[PDB]
Amino acid sequence: MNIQALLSEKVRQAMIAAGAPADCEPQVRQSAKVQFGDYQANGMMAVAKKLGMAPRQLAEQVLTHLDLNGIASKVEIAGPGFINIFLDPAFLAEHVQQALASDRLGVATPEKQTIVVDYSAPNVAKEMHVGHLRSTIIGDAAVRTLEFLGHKVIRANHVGDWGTQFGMLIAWLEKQQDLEGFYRDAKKHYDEEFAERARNYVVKLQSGDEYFREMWRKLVDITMTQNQITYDRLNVTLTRDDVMGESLYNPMLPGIVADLKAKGLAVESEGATVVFLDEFKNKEGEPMGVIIQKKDGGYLYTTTDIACAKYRYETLHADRVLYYIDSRQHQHLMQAWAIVRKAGYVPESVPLEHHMFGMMLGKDGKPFKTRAGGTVKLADLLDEALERARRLVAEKNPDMPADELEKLANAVGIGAVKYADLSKNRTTDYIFDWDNMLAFEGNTAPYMQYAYTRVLSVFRKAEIDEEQLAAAPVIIREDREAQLAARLLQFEETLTVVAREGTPHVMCAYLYDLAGLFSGFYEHCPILSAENEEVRNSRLKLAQLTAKTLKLGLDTLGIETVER
Ligand SMILES: NC(=[NH2+])NCCC[C@H](N)C(=O)O
């Protein structure tokens, strides 16, 4: 089910038998080149230098404690201590059929966990922007993957629905009785007497006053109604039942600042309440004063990220929390989490992980503006995708838009938006590019969609006998068959990487190499016929699992499929 995992524990045990410590790293990775096998163990030389050994020498001794019959057709040593592993065709055929039996493609369902995923997290009365856009795509993908792996995934849309800014906004709403336009006019008129009533409305909302709280509800509702619509178009799994905004934590904030002083916390600096963290000393060596409650009395983004962590453990019972937030907030998160753990609000088991991403830029590095400038309106981005997508899919037209073409342009358009983001490593600044992403040539949503259709057409347009095809025997004899078969089987371990590291681009690179391997399997390897039905069925069974694997793999990234 997980070849790398299986091999990795066997190599570690051999090593251990050779004198290696218990915590040794076999370093079994997928082979870079087919002449090196399916997998190789890379970590011999490190241990060899500490065992007083030649890399080859250890590796050789290792290869004596290593029981790989039935698993690897052959296992040779190479270069300075590498162990190279060619998987046995039997083993491949057995696990390919076996995987063709589960609707899960044999992918294990590990010890279930409650995972909280903090993603998207826009702000009320401000326009949703590309950072939230990225957060939404990457986070949703992680949600889908973890959901497929079996876990109770709790979506936590951490909306910025609290802050001094509302006093101004709510006042402007009152006088009124374009999200961008609303804030600006309130801003100008607050500055342009507005200001007193608006600070005084910030106090009034802080305290009960249902008149105000309804107004705050009405504002939150306008922003979240619009965003949900964006979420819908993006076929993202976020729903309004998943909104867990900063507001949610207000009631517990004085309970926390209170607890923290009981250890733990200083009224030092200019009044206010600061935790001082020696981990974050100034260059002069002055500890970082992280304010959790101002002299003004109001609380802060830090306070609310503390509560939110404490809450997710104490109340949600998360085993793990994933935060898909822009890289620039990294030390904010590390400061808040530093305080959370010092106060013992969540234990060390239970990760709390910052899955950072980088900025979204335009064609050459400027901060990325939508069509016709403005302040980046995502509905515009999504409109422009579809217009391009529609005109793009116009060629080779015949079937009605209705559900035929229109669903097709939508899959391709929205697919491109997501997949162009997901296919790139999240830590990298992402240079948007219409033409690269809507292409069919490289690692794109449309290329993948195209390939999926090609696989399905190869399969369906032939014959059918589900119950009989399932008794077909899959025999690996060609070298491309063994390669395809092995790639297919690495689907779980790709999933596992994505789920551990939070990097959906690993799957994209998998599904692209996979579709590359099918095309080469299609051309240089004939589909019907040779050994009549014998070999025909095997190849069909491999096109079958490839179809099922692309489908599934793309449904974890949130990317739809057509059949045309
Ligand atoms: N737990 C968190 N701090 N989540 C992220 C909140 C991000 C915030 N909504 C923003 O627009 O920047």
Residue numbers in the entry: 1 to 177, 188 to 202, 205 to 576
What's in the article?
A member of the class I aaRS, the arginyl-tRNA synthetase (ArgRS) possesses several distinct characteristics. To better recognize these identity elements, ArgRS possesses an N-terminal domain of roughly 100 amino acids—the Add1 domain, which is unique among aaRSs. Here we report the first crystal structure of E. coli ArgRS (eArgRS) complexed with L-arginine, and a series of mutational studies using isothermal titration calorimetry (ITC).
E. coli ArgRS contains the N-terminal additional domain (Add1, residues 1–112), the catalytic domain (113–382) including two insertion domains (Ins1, residues 164–221, and Ins2, residues 258–311), and the C-terminal additional domain (Add2, 383–577). The refined structure contains the whole sequence except residues Q178–A187, D203–E204 and the C-terminal M577. The crystallographically invisible residues (178–187 and 203–204) are part of the insertion domain 1 (Ins1) as defined by Cavarelli and co-workers. A well-ordered L-arginine binds in the active site of the catalytic domain. Although 2.5 mmol/L ATP was always present in the crystal growth solution, ATP molecule is not visible in the electronic density map. Three residues in the region (A121, N123 and H132) formed hydrogen bonds to the main chain atoms of L-arginine and adopted similar orientations as observed in yeast structures (Asn153 and Gln375 of yArgRS), independent of tRNA binding. The side chain recognition motif, which dictates the specificity of the enzyme, contains three conserved residues (D118, Y313, D317) making direct H-bonds (or salt bridges) to the guanidinium moiety of arginine. Another residue R324 formed two hydrogen bonds with D118, stabilizing the orientation of the latter. A closer look at the active site of the eArgRS-L-arginine complex revealed a closed loop of hydrogen bonding moieties, consisting of L-arginine, Q341 and Y313. In particular, Y313 of eArgRS acts as a gate-keeper: keeping the binding pocket open in the absence of arginine via the Y313-W162 H-bond, while locking the bound arginine in position after rotameric rotation.
